[model samples]
Target: AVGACVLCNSQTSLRCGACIRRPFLCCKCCYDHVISTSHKLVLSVNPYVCNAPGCDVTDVTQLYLGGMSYYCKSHKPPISFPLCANGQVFGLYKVTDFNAIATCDWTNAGDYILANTCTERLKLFAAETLKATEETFKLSYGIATVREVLSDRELHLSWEVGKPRPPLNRNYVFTGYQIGEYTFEKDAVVYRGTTTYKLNVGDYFVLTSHTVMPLSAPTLVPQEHYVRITGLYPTLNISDEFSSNVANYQKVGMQKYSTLQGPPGTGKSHFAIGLALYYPSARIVYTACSHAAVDALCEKALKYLPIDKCSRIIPARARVECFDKFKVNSTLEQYVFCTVNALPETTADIVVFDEISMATNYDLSVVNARLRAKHYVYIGDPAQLPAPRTLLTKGTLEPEYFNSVCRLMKTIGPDMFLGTCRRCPAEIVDTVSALVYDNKLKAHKDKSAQCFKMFYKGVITHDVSSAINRPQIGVVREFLTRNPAWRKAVFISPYNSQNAVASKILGLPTQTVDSSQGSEYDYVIFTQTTETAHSCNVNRFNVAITRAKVGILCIMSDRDLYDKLQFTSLEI
Candidate 1:
């Protein structure tokens, strides 16, 4: 029983190539008939097959969008594919006729070239003879497109890792014009490679035989502080001799756990320094959520403590700029300096956690499990951003109302909520204390040594409803350019997306309000993107509104939020 054409009822070994059914047709009817132009003819023996199990559907007509795939009408399996193969692709196919889909430059592979055809899968064939081999294994290729152009040599790239899940940065690749099998090595923060390829903002590069560049697997650090947080440890039996040797702060108590909640610029870091300096011989691990906070603390500690006594635990293979900016060097390595995520196995006399308000129970628990200490001082502002509600660590209580620090404080009670504002100007402190802190925070009286009074007011507002924050960046750039002494200026936004744009455009260090906790800048350019009052009424707003010490330039799109707060506009 030989196959026959459906159109002409004639014996034929060819099928219509246009539709998914792949209906059999005779050459006479396929070529000569009026419908023939719409449906081209191909061999009846189809080469493409469905990927589903227990299905013999071989109609390649209904091809999947990305990568080479066929969906079987008989077996309706949920087909999901990445935009590129293993994050690699030669080119994006607008119309799938198997052109140079990304990069087809293998001219140097000794007369053999890798090719894909409609009938057979990806094949290695002699260029001239058209000779082929058995079915070759599918290659997972990477097509990393430049998501952002940071600089000539620096770029942020993203590629798909199969779908339902969005695109990510993992697999290795380079531009289509450049041909080489490049692999990337993963560091704590970034992926590094040896090849140099020219790329633009929208340009895409290709990679073949690509796999995810995995970070160095973290070894399990022993959990020794289980008793420390739980208050199961014995009461400290400190002698008068030992207690008298330390600072006055230590004389208050030799308690197991203590917490301090304070508003912005109120010497939270200074408090930590007191503990550290008082117990110079005691092993202390001062940790914060951000490099900026940790680095700033270490740099400040350098002013009092010797370089050997202060250690900045940075990210593994962190950016060179981060290392250089914080004055991190071999001198500091005399103390146990390591990455935040990769902490060393060493017990401490004191474990001071800065920005504790931003840490989740899980975050605290994880660190506490690894770092054993006799005294734990958790310092943060609960009025600022609470621990972020992430997918894994959704608190049982309201996420905003509860964090590890808050929970611990309920158990241990707050040692003190520091009320003095020693950093921000009097006007800024008074406004924020009234609006955000319920008049709990008071500005220090001694403002005689204040500098950089460029702004008429401590807090100046600019409604950027007319433009997309370029004006804010411009003003900040101009201010910084004209005033060379105001080097501690930074841009802070509640939303990281806003900060990203602000950082890229302004060429200034920009941080999210959450990251900027325990960090103070002399001047701040605050870019507000939220139009809704609901978004503006969060603790993050409190953090954003209070970061500036000398002055703050508020770039707002929504003045209605200020109306909600009933504050008179300080607009210029």
Candidate 2:
């Protein structure tokens, strides 16, 4: 009979409950399921079929058989019913009741567990149990039976700290992690629920709960840290944080010690302005690794920011200085961080260090410890070239420290990273990305006139001196002749001789690639100084390519070496 008991597997004209599944159950099996576990029951006044077409019903009445009736009952049931699925669960379970907050037998551990937060222990346990139970269920059943079964309550999330594991690391901050989609019965239906939700070790939100991309520009709202800055400094306009950048925004802005990292051309520079903008009223000191970066950064900031409102101290470095009446030192020589005495023994509202990776770890520490600022912003791309050896020559700081931390790159938490490629074309971003992350480079793309151009002939060396390619400059001139409205760009070379050679011939400002750090031009022409057999490390190449805003032109000498990099020239 269709009236068979859901538990006993026997004919039962008597039905007890109203459920989407197992709406009817024999009196005996129902008792075992209810008592053996903490499952609460609802007795229905009427009978219902409650069915999924292709799942097995429990043949035997067993308690916690995870039997068909209650196998996934913690958050789901045995059947692959649509409603049987759950959503991706994030946790921050707050207990309004003081008595039960820490008193509950969450794991049935009355005295064994001394402390518990609703989100942490609860969410972790549920995900594990559901993953294990459903795994076995699918083994007996088919893949179709694997259902989304994560309850919002199942994940223990906390935007708080002071736990046993010590959320704060050596640098006094928690590490940032990522939440991603996981598990599926088929390609179409992924179990994105908490149990099925996958989190990445590497790495947002309502206008303050809605999930947006972290890399997209941020919404202009005061609650967001940078949003307030944009309100005053209109130049702080960045792309909204959609799905990718929001996570980074939340992480970097929310922590005391954090880092911002990305491949070349990802816009790490703009985020620095956002931080400065965030604290419009507070005393802030913005510095760069070298005077070149400092000069360019100050120029960029003044064009947009009216920092006169902040009232920086006068006297030292007239062109670039931020001070609120020199507290510790009368001179602002250290404000630029061009040398060791760049920072004063003063407390600031926020300290933003752009192009930090180019700075030695010793300088990073001086900024980290000396500023004594409430909010610290460190901006850099570690994947680029190493810091200058000036710090090593000083012989004051030990190698162990540098080996331990660089750019505070070793620090973690709340450090936002730019994801979208605003500068690099789709054709080039992927190739540069592979090189930055130390992955195999992409194969060459089509020779269309795109943002990136590669030439097989360039750079002839006459002994120690390097020669420039005449036709290479001709090609650049040819492009500009057509698109005269195009931006004027820079020509970069690997060695000083090559830099002078290119600059004299093209009548353009040229510098060695290392000197060009933290500077950008509308377009850029990169020259190859080494021989055809030369191998450029990923870091050096990253700095060369990312400096371009509109497009990149490469005068590469070695065809064999050129073909080695697998750059897909798709204009994505």
Candidate 3:
């Protein structure tokens, strides 16, 4: 009975699940025969190659931990593998595309196998055929194969045998090809989804590997208003009787300079919309650090304001799909949502800078000088994110130069501090509130809301046995696959390397903490790629944790990082 294939143990030996008492041999055998959808593995194939392709191998194996899956040594908790590679081509498509209305779908670009077409009918390969065939094109130079298939659905061709390439930068071409008499080479930027662009004879082209135009000489920018601080302005007390009172914030908005501080999900962007509505006739200029931040404010403003009254000032580099309806070119309508750098030189009755804490003194000064405003409202979370590192050292010389309101906060303090955490559950609020908010942030009491009602587990941590990203990717992929509705979940981290790895595998919204400042998500999967706590600052960590409204999953090599942050670990 114990020979092999207890279920059909004629050829070989493998066992799985509970109460079945059945032995199964190959991965396909167990997967096909199991009537019960949920089961664990009792034994696995010796020296299994794992579910994912391109993984280097060693012996002494099983699909350890008794899961109904076969994973390699690196993949402890096996995750679903969406990627497929034959030899000619290797890449991943996105889950959004895989689950699209039509099986044949398109995407904004990250990483995928490049398909070239000379005929009018463009020939694009699907993920179904990639794993089965080697018909996909090969890299022009045999250096390395595709390293990542990013979320936007572009292929990041890096990696040789096991060694890395020159450097991993966003938006560059890795390979090319020579067709017939002419060459149909593939050179890509960051977001071009497909390699098949219509071309004409003698078309001019130029390529550059540089991340950006070489920086000019660092300009010494002067600090404008450096003020001293004694204490914070008294809390505006929004939750008090006047919480819904739009008129109450008018005085604060009318001030020459004012600051509104809050923790994550306190509705700072909502206040920006309130200021615009309160001063109906007043022209407002709203700006933020990232395009998503501007889009957040724009979405809020559009609810009450008409299309003619508002204009979204987008830069050349912004994605077209991000702002579909409000694509009216960045004009001086009654109200405008723009990035700090994209702010047109125009006067406004009131200017609101959301996520100002991430802005440097030089940036604030540049916008302040360009757009003449009677009132300046600086809205942001000082505890969440700080200004990114800059080449100009003088921009960061003064302590007040650190954030948009660092000096104003020191001098006048915040005009108002919104204490209620409206987006996240109490479990999530507790971690960041104590870590950054000094135990001041309180979760919304209404349990019937969408955010609270859809709540699953709170903060869960996976103590990854390996130092690499395979286990981390697997855990996130497994959870997302289980809860298909949570496809909108975001993968966040402080390091680009971590984001790149997760983005490549999951093909979800993989973002750095700074980029996701004003955004919120139902589920957030955070990866602490660094072993040491020194690399990840409190501000970065605060933003990463507070972004989740319903649930958050943290993956790390050890639990010490949580303990050091005073976070009680919920090990899974």
Candidate 4:
């Protein structure tokens, strides 16, 4: 018996005997023979075969072999071993010798046709088949579905970017698959397999082999830019009281209350603006008794801080969206210049109430309630005139109105005073300081002596030449002529009735002390009517007399008026 050759179709008696002894040697050859014989069988039964009469080519090998009896003794069916259809071979067989029969048709052979059809069928099928290749694999556990797939292979995941699976703007190469489980990364319990799984037809095979990839942390956005004041003249250091109290507030997450009391020209407005600019995070509010004061404060702040920072300074007439009330406005210009009211309520980090003394108790209370900032700085001189009698005490003639004004001053916070006047001549400052603090009061010894030179010349006497009995006007004109560059002047009158006198004297509109609350003048002239010991109107008198800086000139009808004047000094 001849055995089949494994590599090529051949047989040998020696090999056959040896293969029988070593069956493993015949295993590979047996498989090859089966495949070839199966192909031949499939072709023999191909539906495309000729179906003509007298075509007695059935049992092809028997006909080819020298066996006339085999062919004649039995009716030869058509070749049916190689069953082929639709250009493909389909059959089953075991290894068989190819040369067992001679004259087996080689050209125009059915077996060859069947083999070619089977090969073509296989090639077409493979070309259309999807092949999934998995590379840089990752796992997504507990994910309903993944949102993104990157080409980077290494997966970067984020849940915060947007909602899961937003509408795609462009075509994506990968789709997010379901999460497998929950897992922990560092301290966070993240979705265990939140990684983007690499996808391909081959991935199908790889996924079946292995499952997940590890994850990393996500990225964030940046913050906005701002400026910080490194230095200031007079070195506006935060006071020990303010710092200590501020720290206490910080610890408790609360706000601190403080008052900055000083006469005009004493840098309260400048300080507030500086503080606001330095601590841009600090919410601040500026309020005025009248529109004019608010305007003045806003203008000063605008001048000192950058224009961009100016937007934070809410104008007087504007409504702070948070308060729902019109911000105190002192001038028409400020009314037009006012910006949004949202600052005081929602935006301010520090609230600064300029000319706070003039604000009514109601307005003050409203501001206190509405203000959101923790650090509140009330900047105003308590010695300044009280709110208008109608607004506060109801009537100008009420003697108790004076008491109310005094009480308002006492009701403010623990006082912090700025004693030195930066804009005033020292001698005039000395005189006014003496009147306000009594002669027993000490002057700011640090002030320059040169700053007092002009005041050393006796107070400018009212030129009786004008004969108008309007001392405020006479003094104003004198100062203007004496110093043409002196554009700023305050005309102080003790009585609202005397306002006409002061207005006529200065030749400018007479502004009440309430209106002039936050303003300053380079020179101030004090108008004197008879100074009486029991005068209840002295509060107004006191406010008007102290408004001057640079120089002060007292105007009176008689020298006796000056002698009789009893000045009561008050400390800030």
Taken over the whole model, the C-alpha lDDT of each candidate is 0.48, 0.42, 0.51, 0.37
Ranking of predictions according to lDDT: 3, 1, 2, 4
Off by over 4 Å in 4: 1-255, 312-347, 391-415, 438-491, 495-514, 530-539, 557-561, 564-572
Better of 1 and 2 by TM-score: 1
Each model's TM-score? 0.51, 0.45, 0.54, 0.40
Q: Across residues 1-572, which tens digit of lDDT does each residue of candidate 3 receive?
A: 13333223244434443312232333333433322233333343332335546655322222333254445556756443311112100111111221121121222111121111111011111211221121122212135343444444344443345432323333223332221111111234242422444333233222222221111111112222324311112234433433453543655543566678877888787777766555566778888767667788888877767778778876664433455556466576888888877767788777788877676544555566567766677888667666533112221223233443655554556677888888876766776777777788887833312221111222333222112255666766776777676677788765655665677789988877766777788887777655544235677777877787776666654444455433334323
RMSD of 2: 23.9
Which wins on TM-score, candidate 1 or candidate 4? 1
**Model 2: residue 133 alpha-carbon error in angstroms:** 63
Tell me, by TM-score, which candidate is best.
Answer: 3
Q: Give the clash count for each candidate.
A: 13, 44, 16, 48
- In model 4, what is the error at residue 249, expressed in angstroms? 13
Candidate 4 lDDT, 444-559, residue by residue in tens? 43333222111111222222211123444554566567655444555554444355455644564454544445555656655553343212244454455445544445554334
For all predictions, the C-alpha RMSD in Å is: 19.2, 23.9, 26.5, 40.8
Give candidate 1 misplaced runs (Cα > 4 Å).
1-248, 251-253, 313-340, 387-402, 410-413, 445-491, 495-511, 533-535, 557-572
CA shift of 11, model 1, Å: 75
Task: State in Å the error of residue 75, model 3.
Answer: 77
Q: Point out the worst 10-residue segment of candidate 1 by lDDT.
A: 128-137
How does model 1 fare in lDDT?
Answer: 0.48
The candidate that achieves the highest lDDT relative to the unseen native structure: 3
Candidate order by TM-score, highest to lowest? 3, 1, 2, 4
